[PDB]
Amino acid sequence: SRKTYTLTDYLKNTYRLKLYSLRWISDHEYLYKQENNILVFNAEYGNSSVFLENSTFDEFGHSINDYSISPDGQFILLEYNYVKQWRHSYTASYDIYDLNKRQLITEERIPNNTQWVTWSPVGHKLAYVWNNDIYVKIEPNLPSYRITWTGKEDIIYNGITDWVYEEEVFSAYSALWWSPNGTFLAYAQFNDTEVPLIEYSFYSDESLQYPKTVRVPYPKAGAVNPTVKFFVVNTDSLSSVTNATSIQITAPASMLIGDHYLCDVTWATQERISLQWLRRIQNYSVMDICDYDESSGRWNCLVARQHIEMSTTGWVGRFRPSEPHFTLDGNSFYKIISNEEGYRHICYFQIDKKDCTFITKGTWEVIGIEALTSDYLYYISNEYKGMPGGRNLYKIQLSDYTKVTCLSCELNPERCQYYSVSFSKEAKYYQLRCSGPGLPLYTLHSSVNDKGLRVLEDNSALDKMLQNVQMPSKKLDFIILNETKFWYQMILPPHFDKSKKYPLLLDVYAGPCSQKADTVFRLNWATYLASTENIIVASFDGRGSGYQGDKIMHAINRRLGTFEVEDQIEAARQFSKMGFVDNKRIAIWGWSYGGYVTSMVLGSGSGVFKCGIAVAPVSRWEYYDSVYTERYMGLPTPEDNLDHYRNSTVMSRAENFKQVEYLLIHGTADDNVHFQQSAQISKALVDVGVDFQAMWYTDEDHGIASSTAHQHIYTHMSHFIKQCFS
Amino acid sequence: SRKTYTLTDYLKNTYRLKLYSLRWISDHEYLYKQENNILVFNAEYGNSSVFLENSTFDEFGHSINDYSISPDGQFILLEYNYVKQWRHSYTASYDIYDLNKRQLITEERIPNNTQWVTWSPVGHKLAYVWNNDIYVKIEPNLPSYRITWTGKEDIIYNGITDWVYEEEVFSAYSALWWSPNGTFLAYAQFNDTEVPLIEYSFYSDESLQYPKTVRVPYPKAGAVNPTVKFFVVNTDSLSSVTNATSIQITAPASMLIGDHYLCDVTWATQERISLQWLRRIQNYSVMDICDYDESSGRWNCLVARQHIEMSTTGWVGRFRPSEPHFTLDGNSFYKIISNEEGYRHICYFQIDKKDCTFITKGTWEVIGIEALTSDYLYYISNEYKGMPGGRNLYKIQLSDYTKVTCLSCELNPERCQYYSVSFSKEAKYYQLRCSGPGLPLYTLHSSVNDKGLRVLEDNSALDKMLQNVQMPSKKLDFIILNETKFWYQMILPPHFDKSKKYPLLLDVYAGPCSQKADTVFRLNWATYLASTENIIVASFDGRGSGYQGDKIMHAINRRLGTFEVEDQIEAARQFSKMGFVDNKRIAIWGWSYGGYVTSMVLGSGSGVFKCGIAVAPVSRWEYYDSVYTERYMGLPTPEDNLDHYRNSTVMSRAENFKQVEYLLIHGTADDNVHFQQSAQISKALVDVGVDFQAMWYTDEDHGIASSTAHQHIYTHMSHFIKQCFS
């Protein structure tokens, strides 16, 4: 028949998925950015109007990669000169455009190289970080206010996170939090003074005669961590002559005793804020709730109003302890915690009551609390059809927990089993985002009746196109390892025939709380490998997996590099026994953590895999950051878990590579998983006399995402798998 | 028949070449180190005696990788704790053993981490460098004498060279020169204060958590060079309370005007020393001759006694201006300079006479002045049979230049056409070292009659072995490019048949003044490729080549990356037209400069080569050191030669790689040709969409010589060529 999904189709993106990215600016309207201009839509009827003309900035004399509209509708922050840094951080230039007088504000503008800018939740206030310091701008055109004075590049961070807090705990560059009505501005301060530095070369443009040495504060497992401090300033009592006074919120005592982290900050009310602290041994976490003392200016976190969240089987939280969701009066909150059975469900807390009440339960987990009203609590779980690789929106009645209602399950069971949601400001309207198993589907509904208002995007255009091509099929199912059931998924070739014996590629990640077997629709490298190369691309979620309860997830506690890789081999070993697998041609590949596992699996001497590809893998945990590695491995000291830190390296298995064909790929500018980790993998192989393929990607980081590097690395890998299979 | 020379034979060294390394300690005896003990031989009769028993140091409690016997016979310098640095430099610990009292001297011993140690030419004096400073030890057991006090790691070097002087001009770490009778000690001082640094990561042992950044003062083309100063101290007028006074010898004026180098120091007499200076534009070089002023302590280099050596066609000297050889009275000297016809021959100088007299002439060149007596001058040239890839020892009568006599030519024309020689102290005896075309042959002779005394080693043992194996044959011959003849050599497979069509590998180097076509016997990778894989491994010496006169050598002046690569293609293009070459399977590979050419050739779009391998190549000249690059390319400024610096990069040709199969190999710790150069080659290929193979060698430098890396890199390459050919 016609043609297949080729590699060029994947790299050149000839089949484009359509999205529908809207931005709720109220409880009735959302902004729908189009390529040229920005519209404004009326959720109820759908009528729309141009918010601002595409031509409006024709002669701005600068490319604008991003806009940001004040919660006022009164102003537009314009971002340009974007210069990416790490996964989330980056700097840019900003100009504020007045929608009132339609004038570009030119006085007291924001500095260039600003690290972070953000409006207050309600007016048109501004808080930005520049040179690691925090500034506040009560008016778009008024002089700025210095909040902090201790900023020092690479040493002291104010309002922005350092490398590890950004990547590991906050997953953001920003470390500042406005209060509900913009009155207060809370922020964190990080001190990297004694954090060791990671140094690597950056070659830059050909014209750069001498390579530069990039050095960033990065604590590797067991190293000295950055320290943290919290402050809350009053953006209403700030002069222009006085130095704004930032009130510090310290403690708790149970955390000050030793190395700790600040893992969450969520405002309860106009004057109440909650902080969540975590010990370096991510076993024990403490949440404090502080009130602003009217006639003292300070903040008081009452003991008795704090809640301890710990774990005897593993660490706290999937990645970081859950986020609390406070009721209007802030006198109580809902948050996802682990079950007495080990399943993450919603617990209802009274700020001054020690015990909470689980409102949900069962052998499934609540992914996330999406919205809260005085009436209902909207959450997303994988309860439906009892399959953890699904996602549906549910709403539970706060008056009767017995009354839980799924709002996505039946909308279109055939095409959608994986939703994500986006509510308007008061949760009066919401947009459901279906991403599989069929083509992505975007629709709008209203919370009063959960009535379907209309389809925002059905990817019909993409569909029309995809019928002229032999697409691969996806099978989501499970197998049974001694009692427990583990899910897997296989990307099957067009006209798949269970009679024939296909070569198999095991796409692996297997990180703690990961999930490679789901119902999401994807047009990636696997699509091609199956559509054109007729290769089955499988994925198995074994011990360590997430969203299935701690008994499975914490299985690899203080024991990384064990069961999760062991089960990957087990899965393949079974896949081959299913009759449509040529057990003579079974390969495995993964990126990041998946690269670590690929290597561990190829070095297991299992004999199951013929060849494999590791892309930017981890070779030994003492090389990765503290926050991540220690959450699962504890500390690398002989009193804690050093022995296992040593038993789970890749180099220690080098000898067993004699039996396989291996391809090691790593970007030289990887700040996350340092090139060092692969430099130690190759050295071990060379010392053992093992031949293998290699490929470095100069100036590329953990993503190898630049246009040319991306197309280059998949082409190289495609050849590799073809060679190993044909 | 039996078997072939396999890859394992090459890597595991199953067929060992025998040598005969002796050390003349007089004009009648030499020391012959054996594995266990050290013997002493009587050149005349051959009788020998044990100089020191192998057991003598059984319980020294340290492995000794090297000995050094005083020109006294009285002492033995013992080297241990060897820690290699660059190509020549390294540090070690030293203990001196007294052969008189057979006692290990324990007082005032030499410091650990000593950079360089050396005896005086006659007694048992010692001069060593430690922490970049010079110390002198008049007695093995007496307190040391600080000569210099300005030493500063990576900034100021005293008595030892910095990176570039070591690698480029002196080809040694040592920068100190004793006078004939040990009275005076001359030394150079280098200042790297403003030399930019090259920085790269060194990952070290797996246990090293954070990679270290190695940084060394390295001037790249056009960068700021180190500056130099010369001093001569009197090791006889040194107290133990006073700070030794070092008299500086400066100028010349014609050199102080701008950037210059110190390219040679050779003592004439007990009180006379000669220095050779070279301008940064290695066009013009000045030799000063200085005498020690008896009643003034200072040194005077008389103008009038200095000689200018320049060149209008190219640079001065093959690599650095030749070394002068003074007559006993130091009132005249012989040195190899370029002919008026462009051929390097011996010129006779009177220290105060401007013009010299050429004693040799012809269309061949004098390789080197080996020995000088009041009677004859012994030199080595490639005059015999008129083939520049040969080497023979000649002696010319100083009384009649008409009387030149070859001393090696006829000894064994069949087996030996490439000799090197080693004279006893007074040139009363000499050892000839034949290294091809047959098996290496070592013999001893006496200068009075040039009588053959006896064979020292004939590699009979290796010969007996090699007859049980199908060895490859070597053909040395030339072709004719418009008038001129250029030599080539081919390593032919056993039972070669000019009827059959063999795949061909072009082994290339082609650096300025290089010579890949010679008559030397070698057991290397080529041996295997031909003996077992039946692949012809050729080598062609075209424009740029050396030992054939400047018309050929200076052809690539200020024009690297042009003719020398062009002719490599030309040679292959002819080789294919010789009927025993499968022009469908022609490959090319090279290391260093040969890697640069391989890349330039593969990016020429010639279509002649199918595949190729570049090992640690140079991609663009602005990346290599100043001294080397500028000697051939001038300065990278728009007023000099920047345009061509830019036209000869490898990246600029990236596009044309679409047509070939390429393998890029580079060591990550290469301090010479920085990994940067290949990081820029791969980046260019990725940006152009070209697929290729790669392989980095973690912690290996320009040599990739460590045991495991060495065996690893040839195995990988062997597979590559086989894939490309079979």
Ligand SMILES: N[C@H]1CN(CCc2ccc3c(c2)OCO3)C(=O)C[C@@H]1c1cc(F)c(F)cc1F
């Ligand atoms: N660097 C890790 C970051 N991360 C957690 C992100 C996150 C933070 C906060 C949060 C989250 C998720 O959900 C809710 O709140 C990961 O998921 C994996 C990342 C990883 C693992 C490896 F082993 C690698 F080698 C390389 C690598 F980047």
